[PDB]
Structure 1
Amino acid sequence: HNMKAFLDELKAENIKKFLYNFTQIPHLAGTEQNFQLAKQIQSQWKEFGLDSVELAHYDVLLSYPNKTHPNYISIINEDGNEIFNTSLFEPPPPGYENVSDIVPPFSAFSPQGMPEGDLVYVNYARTEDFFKLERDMKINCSGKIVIARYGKVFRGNKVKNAQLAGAKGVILYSDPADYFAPGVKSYPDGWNLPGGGVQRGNILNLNGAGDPLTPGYPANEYAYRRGIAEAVGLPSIPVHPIGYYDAQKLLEKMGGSAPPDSSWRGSLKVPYNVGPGFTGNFSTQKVKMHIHSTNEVTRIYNVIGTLRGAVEPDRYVILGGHRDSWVFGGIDPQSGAAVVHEIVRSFGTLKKEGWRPRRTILFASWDAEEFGLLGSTEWAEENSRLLQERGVAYINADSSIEGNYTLRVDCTPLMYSLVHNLTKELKSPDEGFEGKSLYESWTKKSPSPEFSGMPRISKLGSGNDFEVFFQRLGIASGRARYTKNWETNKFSGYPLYHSVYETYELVEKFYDPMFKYHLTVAQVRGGMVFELANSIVLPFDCRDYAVVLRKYADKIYSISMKHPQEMKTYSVSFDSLFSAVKNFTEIASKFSERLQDFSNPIVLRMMNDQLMFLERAFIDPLGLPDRPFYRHVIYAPSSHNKYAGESFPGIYDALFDIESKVDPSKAWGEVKRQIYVAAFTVQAAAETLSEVA
């Protein structure tokens, strides 16, 4: 009854069976079908042997198209005749043409409206794309409809950026440059996005809030709800996504300015002119959106399973991933949910033979992740006091695969050593690495840029259910999946992401026929949970935080040093931050020696508490500026791209575009304030590792 027993019990064939089972019908958040699946998972987790399995429900703001009043976009003429209309639905894949309740493509939480106007093309609608338009090209987006390609950044940031440029609507589309890999065929004959394929997805800017109506508090039965006008994170302009056949029709007539360079050009046979408006012959034609989606408070259901710890039942190791999907969820999330299902089954097999983990393991099937991480966040808001005093670690479990090339791990530095050690004990599933470790194949394919013989591990970003646990509550968090080769593949994510084409057959035919990558990911996620829940000493190495803190302090200093004159004028010093990082390094080294040197369960648990509370020490209860639910001082989601992690975010944002601020004394004063905050937090975290008295 050890990790090997746990790991050997996991079966590729089981994951395949569960994935099939979870992907036959859509499981849209807030729908009857997703409630039925919740009840199925609850029943089976009970069957598998968990001690208790409960549903936790909340009533949250969701968004749905109007079934009898469809969303679409038109090219209109001067008479007001609609001469081109975008599609009302994606052509369903082979054998699914009779499946009902496929939600048509839409941007969740768009307001209603029917704006008409001239088109401006804004590339990826990134902060720098808008800088280039407004500052360099002198193109004014005010009162224009903007058309943006999907890719590079979270779509919620694209919409915020368009809104602040004064756009009156946004059209998102999938360019073949970003969603069509050269030499591969469109679904169903390969894994590429067809011209009729469209990416669904919410366009909120919640900054960690959870349910737009109840920031701070769970959306329970007696919750007081904000009115819509005071809701968190809703867009103020209509937004709608389209495929590249339709996008070609909207872009082909574009006039005004040429694209400023080749990074603005996708792969369609159009000029990619920025606009505004169409070329001479068509200059009186306009674009008109028709958006009739509604926001509605709707009940959602999380499944929470508990496997009580034998020795420390009041210490929680959490394995969590979502269950709601946009349509069939063939990759996102059911490739993860099937992996979780099999992990529960394996742990339950051990439990039935009389085993218990040392610490309590909690298993979660989250709802409404696609609509803003709503299920995980309301649950964490309800249980925040238990989680912050008892939460050892959170391992996420969304999509198990986004490619078939190598492992991808994003996690806290506290988990680096755990991950290196676990992957050295696992077999590589890769062709050409037969009989070699996962560590060896991963390190070869994804080398660390700093250290030879080590693999690359990314900072956690966001856009997934670990956000409340890590950046709000400061619980050590990690995620792992199989991924593509980013070096040779210039497309954003996997092409069929959030489309009707993301099916069981996509996975079985193209991504993972033998379910070996799925099994490898179940071993990594399950193996991490196993060690976190069973190791006598928590498997965190504080010294790994010291190394990265120095790297981040060097990076942020280098950013500031682009402005040597202002650093002189305003006496901007990084000395305190470096001092704190030096101290952290020294105290962590001493703590590590003591951890190696002690039959005393109180000393042990005292030191396990120091390990557990170390991630917690990086939380500032005041939050980051205007983002009160991003409280971790070392890591926040980038303010320009929710998917990407940023280090020392408070200082990073204080420095960003600082040369453009009208009051440099004020701007540099805020840089200095954020330096103080960061140095203090690092020192305070370091001091939690000092001898306690």
Structure 2
Amino acid sequence: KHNMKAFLDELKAENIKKFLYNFTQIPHLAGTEQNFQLAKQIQSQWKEFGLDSVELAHYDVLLSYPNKTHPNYISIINEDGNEIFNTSLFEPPPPGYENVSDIVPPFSAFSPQGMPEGDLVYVNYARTEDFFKLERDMKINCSGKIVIARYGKVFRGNKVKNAQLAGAKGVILYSDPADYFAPGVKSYPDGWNLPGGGVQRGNILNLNGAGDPLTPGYPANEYAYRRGIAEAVGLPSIPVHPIGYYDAQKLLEKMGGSAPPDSSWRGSLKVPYNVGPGFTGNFSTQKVKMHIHSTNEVTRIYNVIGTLRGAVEPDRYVILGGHRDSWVFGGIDPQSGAAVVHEIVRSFGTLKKEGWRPRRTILFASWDAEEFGLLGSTEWAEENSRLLQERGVAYINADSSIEGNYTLRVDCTPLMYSLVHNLTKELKSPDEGFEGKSLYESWTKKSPSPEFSGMPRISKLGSGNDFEVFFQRLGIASGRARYTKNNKFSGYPLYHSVYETYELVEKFYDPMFKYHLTVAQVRGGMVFELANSIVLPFDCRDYAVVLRKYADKIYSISMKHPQEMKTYSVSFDSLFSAVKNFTEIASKFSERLQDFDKSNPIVLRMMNDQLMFLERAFIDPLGLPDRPFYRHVIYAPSSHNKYAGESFPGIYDALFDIESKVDPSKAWGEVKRQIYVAAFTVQAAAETLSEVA
């Protein structure tokens, strides 16, 4: 028969392996011919595999590339203006790829051009708290300095924003072996560690959900009216460039001024990690000079969109999407995910050829330009937002299937928690020592929930991937799953480097493609249940549980300031009341969902619609303050780290560093305003689960 087991058994490790090999032989950088040819290949194969329709959806968006005949580099310059040290113009290519053309050299996408020259300040990870320590405690002024920051802990766009607000005139990003060289493992090609010549590429925008910097709110189609560059969203104002740790050692070794304030500021290089500004006595007249000549240009990108029409509810969409563009070869990011999607489409297509169709429509997407700011998924969602917000059941992301080989990682809406627990109990663990045990069992053992005994950890969705528009803007229930290591936000060692290849995966991460297969079963199994369960597989009671946890957490932050809460009459009573009501109404809804007359398709659908629009109810059409495309009131990407999720973000940001605000009455008024908005939204979401009339 045609059930989930049939679907799951058709998935093959050996197919994922062949697809990964096929997708990682040449670079597939967004906006290049190679990436368009791969799009056309995917489209053809998905048609072959049996999808009803497979189309390319193209957009013309702002991208950024280095100048081929005027390379980016950094120097140490002496008082004469002689360049006595230059950083490398490219990463040494890996074995057997030394003749591959069109490897893009390391650069920070969307950097402006410039040639700033100045004294260095070392700013650790360039986090908000690192700049607080520099400016408040150590009294070091970054104005007119070039800052040097180690990659890790937070999204690099936030480091750049923070440097810019500190008055920096340039930023140098580098990979410290503390964060990108695991002890006892060899550098690529002999192991999975970053070599000293390796460099992490990546964009440095602060889009806050906007998509193409030139067309916020609307798709970048053929007749789009663009903003001028000066009004574009999210572009940095200062030049930025990334380097490897051989080059970083040269720049750091001469640094003078103040000592590091403590050991959390020192990486693993043989240097003092002095904060500066500038170099020690002998070299105090030498400066650092950046040379950045990258250009921003409007460039066509292509999404592949495949449809498998639903037999019963064709107007309800379950979406499996992940990106196809890569920085270089994309051996992990994204092709380990894209190969998994390809095999999922192939398996669904096999069932379709035997006469089966899912209950609801499944949409499959191969997104472009994820690396330049989630541009392909965001522009497509802008184009199709009316269809998605009335018809979108769920979005499952499918970027990198592995970032380690230790255990499963899931980040998703609470509405999916039950679905994920149930599915993982039915899947086999691929882990050594758990032969014949469930994935749920191995995952819960290796990654226990901090709250609940006998449960696995499931994280909040943050951002930095293509689910952002669906979840944070549109309020469609979203999830993601991958295999992971034992700081999650820094990336694995060869992240966004030329060394992330097929061989990296086949030799060091997953030689038997068993972790890829397990990830295909989790993502595919989610999609299968979402598109085929009679009653949507969402449990509203799980949202009630987390809302109480988030309410407790935000109340606790505010309670650091008891005198102000008394003075300005700051009460969380309304939020706790709303959460109590949501808990009560959700419990009654769950009873009706179990009890309702199961022969009545209208009651079922009213109730499926209530389930589908529950995530939608958390959207505030006015958005969060100064972030109009982050509309979800429960979750937003952290204002300090795009990758991390923050709960009750409007109240969290109103409280953050509040003791430093010059007008406390106004600052606490805005806290109260955010409490009202949160309480109201929670109550309004609860009421969507009440009896409808």
Q: TM-score normalised by the shorter chain: which range applies?
A: over 0.9
Give the drift of 1:662: 0.1
Partner Cα separation in structure 1 for residue 392 and residue 289 of structure 2:
50
For residues 251 and 475 of structure 2, the distance between their equivalents in structure 1, rounded to whole angstroms, comes to 46
Once the two structures are TM-superposed, the CA of residue 490 in structure 1 deviates from its matched residue by 9.1
Q: Deviations over 1:510-536 (max 9, x none)?
A: 000000000000000000000000000
Question: 1:415-460 deviations in whole A, cap 9, x for unaligned?
Answer: 0000000000000000000000000000000000111000000000
Partner of 2:235: 234
| Identity score, percent | 100
Aligned mates of 1:541, 1:3 — CA distance in 2: 20
Please say if residues 423 and 438 of structure 1, whose CA atoms lie closer than 8 Å, have aligned partners that are also in contact: yes
Q: Is the 8 A contact 1:177 1:491 kept in 2?
A: no
Check whether the contact 1:176–1:268 (CA below 8 A) recurs between aligned residues: yes
Q: Residues 491 and 418 (structure 1 numbering): CA distance in 2 closer, same or farther, change over 3 Å?
A: closer
C-alpha contact 1:123 1:264 (8 A) present in aligned 2? yes
Is the CA contact (8 Å cut-off) linking 1:107 and 1:201 kept in structure 2? Answer: yes
Q: Which residue of 1 aligns with 2:537?
A: 539
Q: Distance in 2 between matches of 1:443 and 1:80?
A: 59
In structure 2, how many angstroms separate the alpha carbons of the residues matched to 1:451 and 1:264? 34
Aligned-pair CA distance for 1:291: 0.1
The DSSP-based 3-state class of the residue aligned with 2:469 is helix
Separation of aligned partners in 2, 1:268 and 1:424: 44
Indicate the SS of the match to 1:78.
coil
- Aligned equivalents of 2:445, 2:150: Cα separation in 1: 33
Asked if the contact 1:407/1:480 (under 8 Å) is kept, the reply is yes
Checking the alignment, whether the CA contact within 8 Å between 1:50 and 1:348 is kept in structure 2 is yes
- TM-aligned CA distance change 1:490 to 1:470, over 3 Å: closer
Separation in structure 2 between the aligned mates of residue 427 and residue 176 of structure 1, nearest angstrom: 36
Distance in structure 2 (CA, Å) of the matches to 1:301 and 1:331: 21
> Is 2:419 the counterpart of 1:421?
no
User: Which residue is 1:296 aligned to?
Assistant: 297
* Deviation by residue 1:140-171 (Cα, 9 ceiling, x = unmatched): 00000000000000000000000000000000
Inter-partner Cα distance in structure 1 for 2:604 and 2:559 = 44
SS class of match (2:490): coil
Q: Deviation at 1:638? A: 0.2
User: 1:257–1:447: structure 2 CA closer, same or farther, 3 Å change rule?
Assistant: same
Measured against aligned partners, the alpha-carbon deviations of 1:476-507 in whole angstroms (never above 9, x if no partner) come to 0000000000xxx7993210000000000000
Q: Deviations over 1:529-561 (max 9, x none)?
A: 000000000000000000000000000000000
- 1:208-229 deviation per Cα after TM superposition (whole angstroms, max 9, x unaligned): 0000000000000000000000
The equivalent residue for 2:396 is 395
| CA distance in structure 2 between the partners assigned to 1:451 and 1:161 by the alignment | 37
Separation in 1 of the partners of 2:548 and 2:332? 37
**Counterpart in 2 of 1:600?**
600
Cα distance in structure 1, aligned partners of 2:4 and 2:264: 49
Deviations 1:574-632 (A, max 9, x none): 00000000000000000000000120000000000000000000000000000000000
User: Are the counterparts in 1 of residues 489 and 643 from structure 2 also a CA contact under 8 Å?
Assistant: no
- The count of corresponding residues between Structure 1 and Structure 2 is 690
Write out per-residue CA displacement over residues 642-688 of structure 1, whole angstroms, 9 at most, x where no aligned residue. 00000000000000000000000000000000000000000000000
Distance, in Å, in 2 between the alignment partners of 1:590 and 1:278 is: 67
Residues 253-277 of structure 1: CA deviation (Å, up to 9, x unaligned): 0000000000000000000000000
- CA distance, structure 2, for counterparts of residue 477 and residue 681 of structure 1: 19
Deviations 1:229-270 (A, max 9, x none): 000000000000000000000000000000000000000000
Note the alpha carbon deviations across 1:181-215, whole angstroms, 9 max, x for none: 00000000000000000000000000000000000
4+ aligned runs moved over 4 Å, structure 1:
none
3-state secondary structure, aligned to 2:136: helix
Matches of 1:257 and 1:630, distance apart in 2:
40
Instruction: Indicate conservation of the 8 Å contact 2:429/2:442, yes or no.
Output: yes
Aligned equivalents of 1:112, 1:100: Cα separation in 2: 25
Give the C-alpha shift of residue 82 in structure 1.
Answer: 0.1
3-state SS of the aligned residue for 2:55? strand
Q: Write out per-residue CA displacement over residues 70-112 of structure 1, whole angstroms, 9 at most, x where no aligned residue.
A: 0000000000000000000000000000000000000000000
2:515 paired residue number: 517
Distance 2:445 2:67 in 1: 50
Please list the CA deviations of residues 342-385 of structure 1 after superposition, one character each: whole Å capped at 9, or x if unmatched. Answer: 00000000000000000000000000000000000000000000
Unaligned runs of 5+ in 2: none
**1: CA distance between counterparts of 2:590 and 2:489?**
43
With over 3 angstroms needed to count, the CA separation of the structure-2 counterparts of 1:602 and 1:388, relative to structure 1, is same
1:491 partner SS? helix
Return the alpha-carbon distance in structure 2 between the equivalents of residues 341 and 390 of structure 1. 24
The answer to whether the Cα contact below 8 Å between 1:317 and 1:360 also exists between their aligned partners in 2 is: yes
Hey, what's the Cα distance between the residues in 2 that align with 1:12 and 1:203? 35
Query: 1:30–1:298: 8 Å Cα contact kept in structure 2?
Result: yes
Contact kept, 8 Å, 1:178 with 1:491, in 2: the verdict is no
Q: Is the 8 A contact 2:171 2:239 kept in 1?
A: yes
The answer on whether the counterparts of 2:188 and 2:195 sit within 8 Å (CA) in structure 1 is yes
Distance in structure 1 (CA, Å) of the matches to 2:384 and 2:506: 38
Say if 1:181 and 1:491, in contact at 8 Å, map to a contact too: no
CA–CA distance in structure 2, aligned partners of residues 184 and 490 of structure 1:
19
Maintained 8 Å contact 1:180/1:491: no
SS of residue paired to 2:685: helix
Mapped partners of 2:325, 2:145: distance in 1? 35
Deviation of the 1:410 alpha carbon: 0.0
* Whole-Å separation in 1 of the counterparts to 2:391 and 2:542: 23
Q: Does the 8 Å CA contact 1:148/1:171 hold for their aligned counterparts? A: yes
Q: Contact 1:206 / 1:232 at 8 angstroms: preserved in 2?
A: yes
SS at match of 1:27: coil
The question of whether the paired residues in 2 share the 8 Å contact of 1:423 and 1:439 is answered with: yes
Match of 1:408 in 2: 409
CA contact (8 A) 1:331 1:507 kept: yes
In 2, distance between residues paired with 1:400 and 1:298?
A: 28
* Residue-by-residue CA offset, 1:33-74 (whole Å, 9 max, x unaligned): 000000000000000000000000000000000000000000
Evaluate the alpha carbon distance shift between residue 101 and residue 474 of structure 1 in structure 2; reply closer, same or farther with a 3 A threshold. same
Provide, for residues 302-336 of structure 1, a one-character-per-residue CA deviation record: whole Å limited to 9, x for no partner. Answer: 00000000000000000000000000000000000
Supply the distance in 1 between the matched residues of 2:595 and 2:151 (Cα, whole angstroms).
54
The Cα shift of 1:339 comes to 0.0
Matched residues in 1 for 2:324 and 2:147: separation? 33
Distance 2:139 2:584 in 1: 52
Give RMSD over aligned pairs.
0.6
Residues in 1 aligned to 2:546 and 2:78: alpha-carbon distance in whole angstroms:
58
Query: Structure 1 stretches of 5 or more lacking a match?
Result: none
Secondary structure at the aligned position of 2:488 is classed as coil
Question: Is contact 2:213-2:233 (8 Å) kept?
Answer: yes
Separation in structure 2 between the aligned mates of residue 381 and residue 590 of structure 1, nearest angstrom: 36
Contact map agreement 1:150 1:172 (CA 8 A) in 2 = yes
Q: List aligned pairs for 1:291-370, cutoff 5 A.
A: 291-370=292-371
Give the 3-state SS of the residue equivalent to 1:57 in structure 2: strand
Structure-2 residue corresponding to 1:371: 372
Quick check: 2:154–2:489 contact (8 Å CA) kept in 1?
no
Other-structure match for 2:685: 685
Is the 2:154–2:490 Cα contact (8 Å) retained in structure 1?
Answer: no
Give the Cα–Cα distance (whole angstroms) in 2 for the partners of residues 490 and 331 of structure 1: 15
Matched, 1:670 2:676: no
Secondary structure at 1:185's aligned position in 2?
coil
With the length of structure 2 as denominator, give the TM-score of the two structures. 0.99
Matched, 1:556 2:577: no
CA distance in 2: counterparts of 1:423 and 1:252, whole angstroms: 50
> TM-score, normalised on structure 1?
0.99
